[PDB]
Structures are given as C-alpha cells and as structure tokens.
Amino acid sequence: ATFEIVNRCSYTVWAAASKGNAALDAGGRQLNSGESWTINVEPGTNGGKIWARTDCYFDDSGSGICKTGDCGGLLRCKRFGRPPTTLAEFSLNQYGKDYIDISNIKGFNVPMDFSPTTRGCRGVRCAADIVGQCPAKLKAPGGGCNDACTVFQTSEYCCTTGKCGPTEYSRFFKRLCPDAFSYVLDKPTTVTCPGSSNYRVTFCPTA
C-alpha cells in the first residue's frame, strides 16, 4: 500500500513510520515545508503508525534527537516515538478490510489529516490548535500537549486494567478533536476501508 506523507506545515517535520518492532519502509525522513514523501507499507501490516517529529538534529549516520516523537534517536525509526505525538494508526488487510484512525492517546504535537486516496471510505482529521489550547498541566516543556497518562502515570489515565472512564483531560482532547481517540476506551472513531486501500497523511492540513 502507498502512503503519501505531505508536510503542509510552515516548519520542517521528520516523518516517521513504524509498527513498533520494525520500520515501515525506510522508517523516517525529513520533510521540509511543502514536501511529499511516498512510502510503501506491506499488505497485512498490523498496528502501523505514522507521526511527525519536530525539532530534530541528526548526524551523518542518522543518529540524533527530536523535541517530539523521537524514536530512540534514529532518523530511520524502528520503534514508536516519544510522546507527545499525534498518531495516524492503521491495520491493513485484516480479514479483507483496512482500519484507520487518529489518536491523541499519546498526546498531540502536529495537526494531521489521514485520508484514503482510493475509494470507499472517509478520512479522519485532528487539526485543531491543541498545543495552543493545551491545559497548563499537560503542556510538555519540550514542546506539544501531553496526554494525561504520560504526565501522571495512573491506572485511570493509562487504562491499565481495562476499566477506565473519560477524564477532564481526555475530554479536552475530545472537545478539540472529536474524530480522534482521546483515551484508551473512547468510543471508537476507526474507519473501515476496502482492503488494500492507499492513503495520504497530511501534516497541518488547514495550514
């Protein structure tokens, strides 16, 4: 499946793509403002994610740091990124269908749209100014708006045992972005697409 990753932000981002234990495609790349990078994701990929990283520095070998979404210091991500990270999440060719969503469960750094480029389903979007509106206690000094699990490490926020409810913090994310997961047990906003759909992830869609 193809995923065109487009940076419409006025700032550079370093796109990342992983399924948690492996890179998807090259796993990451710099995207200056306006640039597009198309990756190929294998059919059947379960639990894939794409995200933006901000404020990165990499040496010639691709080792370095980012202020949001760092993945072990690698330009080329092999694992998931450090919160806060707005997440485009997908599982492909799952009994004939693809499933996509956006999640704020790991916080928010960059606004995104995640849409099919092929027919048969709608896209999802979280493009409100969550960083600007972020509750004081969730603001990450390194940049972005942390989720409450990251900040407070409680069973309730982290949904550790599977029984949690919405919270004042989750409700903030949900108010700003109704179409994204705000906590682990949120009413799902997953979209079912035809198996083997192709997609576009756009950072700063309303830039």
Curated annotation (Swiss-Prot):
CDD domains, A to Z: TLP-P
Question: Gene3D superfamilies, from UniProt?
Answer: Thaumatin
Cysteines paired by S-S bonds = 9-204, 56-66, 71-77, 121-193, 126-177, 134-145, 149-158, 159-164
Q: Does the keyword Cell membrane apply?
A: no
Signal in keyword set:
yes
> Which InterPro entries does this UniProt record tie to the protein?
Osmotin/thaumatin-like_sf, Thaumatin, Thaumatin_CS
Chief place where the protein resides: cytoplasm
Subcellular location(s): the record lists: Cytoplasmic vesicle
Keywords associated with the record: Cytoplasmic vesicle, Disulfide bond, Signal, Taste-modifying protein
Question: Which residues does UniProt call coiled coil?
Answer: none
Give me the segments passing through the membrane.
none
Q: What's in the GO CC field?
A: cytoplasmic vesicle
Extract the Pfam families matched here. Answer: Thaumatin
Return the similarity comment.
Belongs to the thaumatin family.
Q: What does the protein in this record do? A: Taste-modifying protein; intensely sweet-tasting. It is 100000 times sweeter than sucrose on a molar basis.
For this protein, the record's PANTHER family field holds: OS03G0233200 PROTEIN (PTHR31048)
State what protein this is by name: Thaumatin I
**Native source species:** Thaumatococcus daniellii
